[PDB]
Write a protein that binds this ligand. Structure first.
Ligand SMILES: Cc1cc2nc3c(=O)[nH]c(=O)nc-3n(C[C@H](O)[C@H](O)[C@H](O)COP(=O)(O)OP(=O)(O)OC[C@H]3O[C@@H](n4cnc5c(N)ncnc54)[C@H](O)[C@@H]3O)c2cc1C
Ligand SMILES: *[C@@H]1O[C@H](CO)[C@@H](O)[C@H](O)[C@H]1NC(C)=O
Ligand SMILES: *[C@@H]1O[C@H](CO)[C@@H](O)[C@H](O)[C@H]1NC(C)=O
Ligand SMILES: *[C@@H]1O[C@H](CO)[C@@H](O)[C@H](O)[C@H]1NC(C)=O
Ligand SMILES: *[C@@H]1O[C@H](CO)[C@@H](O)[C@H](O)[C@H]1NC(C)=O
Ligand SMILES: *[C@@H]1O[C@H](CO)[C@@H](O)[C@H](O)[C@H]1NC(C)=O
Ligand SMILES: *[C@@H]1O[C@H](CO)[C@@H](O)[C@H](O)[C@H]1NC(C)=O
Ligand SMILES: N#C[C@H](O)c1ccccc1
Length: 516
């Protein structure tokens, strides 16, 4: 409010200091090296560059190469596009069997995501026990929001869903608010009112162009070490040739390669569980039993309704929040090619008309799994990942509560106009896929287990309190930090990009304050 961004084209001014990793003149010594130009990595690198020489290394290319990443209309397209190793969406399947994606592009997952912007639940900070500078946290949210967050305009389906949330008892009406609070609200979006996507790469425009260099298609393969200290990285370019870059003096390497990429790189570099790394004949630099451990994926459960008259497609902006479930709905055109991981399997029925995807998210979650290496040498080979969905019964109980609330939502007068048949029950809707069950808990448990998908908000693998201290330093190693979604075991809110955008700059400011 007051400070929020305006509608405007995507600002690629920063491309004036973006270079192909094939350029050997980038090799040398910097004050900071940031690995991964994503949600946390971009504002971290921009912030550090205000005073110091920074090299940001990103394995993907620049978003201008894939224009459908730059509009709200292109959201499904990037997920429908086949993964050829260069596309901004990298496809994967967890060992649980659930299809999923991660970003491979400068800007990270903010370039492919659903655009929902929220600040962290204000209780999160005290829950962590970290000594946060809370005033600075809030100044930093405003720094991000001034650049890339707007108040969304009205969308007919979002307004329907918001009336339904309220009628179904998800109270109070919070109006327009960026805050994760119980009740129903319109939140911010990183899509602007013209549908232009804004993203973490635009925060590079706040860096000092004399101090910040960005290398794209830079695949960082290994952290180099010396008092055990990180001293640099090895990265390879798109032609396959290798390159080295180093930090100097009191500088530091920061890993911002995401929930999947950060544990992978730590393990490949010999930071990780001693018996596991020894089992792979990877030389142990720093034993730590928790690298790649405590990896979480909040479950998404859903139904799809097919209204008898067309509904307008929308981006998610209206949120229904309770402590035990977070709910939204997306409306979408039909398609004959599925957006990968929207549904949990490729063998899911295709919609022939417009549909509403009505969704609940389990908080936490309490179930967790791990990231392990698939290759002990090649960072381009994706690691194995398993989330163990619903292995914790509290998660299953919370999904049951969310699914019952979705039942309530389907029974509201707000959603009544979208039934195919004017009958009393919710079997008057036409469904794509499996409808909601029956009244007893056992049928809701079965529905939750069988039809789970990824919410895409996975986190963990390099936790504060396990791998990192409260300053995000890797314990036992000087000049090495981790800043991204690998760092916390629970969500900060229903939609975490806002927290991790903030976190990139905030830790950058903490580093600079430490320096001084
Ligand atoms: C489809 C989808 C939709 C989403 N929608 C929303 C939403 O609407 N709202 C919301 O709040 N959250 C959303 N999220 C979640 C949120 O966007 C992510 O949790 C968050 O962006 C993760 O930030 P990160 O910095 O941890 O990772 P990333 O943003 O993915 O950054 C990691 C970067 O590191 C790079 N990298 C990895 N390994 C290496 C390496 N070895 N060398 C060099 N570079 C490397 C990657 O290419 C990537 O750019 C969505 C997620 C997905 C998948
Ligand atoms: C980098 O250069 C190689 C040729 O040496 C080219 O194939 C590749 O597309 C370039 N990448 C970018 C991001 O410009
Ligand atoms: C930070 O902002 C939130 C709103 O997002 C507000 O509730 C809180 O009081 C603020 N905290 C401080 C320390 O200013
Ligand atoms: C590790 O190396 C030893 C030889 O030093 C060999 O016996 C063992 O099979 C190797 N294990 C792996 C997983 O490569
Ligand atoms: C906010 O976080 C606190 C502390 O973890 C939790 O008790 C509360 O339920 C959360 N509120 C919402 C609306 O998620
Ligand atoms: C690597 O991933 C493949 C999937 O293509 C899987 O079949 C294989 O078991 C994995 N190997 C290791 C060592 O993780
Ligand atoms: C679930 O998680 C909680 C907290 O982490 C833990 O106490 C419990 O043992 C786990 N398992 C089940 C089945 O609740
Ligand atoms: N992330 C996120 C949004 O909530 C979302 C967007 C599309 C489908 C499900 C959920």
């Amino acid at each position: 409010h007051h400070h929020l961004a305006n509608t405007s084209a995507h600002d690629f001014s920063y491309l004036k200091f973006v270079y192909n990793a094939t350029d050997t003149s980038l090799e040398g010594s910097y004050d900071y090296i940031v690995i991964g130009g994503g949600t946390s990595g971009c504002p971290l690198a921009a912030t550090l560059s205000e005073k110091y020489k920074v090299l940001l290394l990103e394995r993907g290319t620049i978003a201008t190469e894939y224009p459908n990443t730059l509009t709200a209309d292109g959201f499904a397209y990037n997920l429908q596009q086949q993964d050829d190793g260069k596309t901004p969406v990298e496809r994967f399947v967890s060992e649980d069997g659930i299809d999923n994606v991660r970003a491979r592009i400068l800007g990270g997952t903010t370039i492919i995501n659903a655009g929902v912007y929220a600040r962290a639940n204000i209780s999160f900070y005290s829950q962590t026990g970290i000594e946060w500078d809370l005033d600075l946290v809030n100044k930093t949210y405003e720094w991000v929001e001034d650049a890339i967050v707007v108040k969304p305009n009205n969308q007919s389906w979002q307004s329907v869903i918001g009336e339904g949330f309220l009628e179904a008892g998800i109270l109070p009406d919070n109006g327009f608010s960026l805050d994760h609070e119980a009740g129903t609200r319109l939140t911010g979006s990183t899509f602007d009112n013209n549908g232009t996507r804004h993203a973490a790469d635009e925060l590079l425009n706040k860096g000092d162009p004399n101090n910040l260099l960005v290398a794209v298609q830079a695949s960082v393969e290994k952290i180099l070490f010396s008092n055990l200290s990180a001293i640099g990285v090895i990265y390879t370019d798109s032609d396959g040739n290798s390159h080295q870059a180093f930090v100097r003096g009191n500088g530091e390497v920061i890993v911002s390669a995401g929930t999947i990429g950060t544990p992978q790189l730590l393990l490949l570099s010999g930071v990780g569980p001693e018996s596991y790394l020894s089992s792979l004949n990877i030389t142990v630099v720093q034993p730590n039993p928790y690298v790649g451990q405590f990896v979480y994926d909040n479950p998404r459960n859903f139904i799809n309704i097919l209204p008898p008259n067309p509904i307008e497609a929308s981006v998610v902006t209206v949120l229904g929040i309770r402590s035990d479930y977070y709910q939204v709905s997306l409306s979408s055109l039909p398609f004959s090619t599925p957006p990968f991981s929207l549904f949990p399997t490729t063998s899911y029925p295709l919609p022939n008309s417009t549909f509403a995807h009505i969704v609940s998210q389990v908080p936490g979650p309490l179930s967790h799994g791990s990231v392990t290496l698939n290759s002990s040498s090649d960072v381009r080979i994706a690691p194995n990942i398993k989330f163990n969905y619903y292995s914790n019964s509290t998660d299953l109980a919370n999904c049951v509560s969310g699914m019952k609330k979705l039942g309530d939502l389907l029974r509201t007068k707000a959603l009544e106009p979208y039934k195919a048949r004017d009958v009393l029950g919710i079997d008057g809707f036409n469904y794509l896929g499996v409808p909601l069950p029956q009244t007893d808990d056992a049928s809701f448990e079965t529905f939750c287990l069988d039809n789970v998908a990824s919410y895409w908000h996975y986190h963990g693998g390099s936790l504060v309190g396990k791998v990192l201290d409260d300053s995000f330093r890797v314990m036992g190693i000087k000049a090495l930090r981790v800043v991204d979604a690998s760092t916390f075991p629970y969500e900060p809110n229903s939609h975490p990009q806002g927290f991790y955008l903030m976190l990139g700059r905030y830790v950058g400011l903490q580093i600079l304050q430490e320096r001084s």
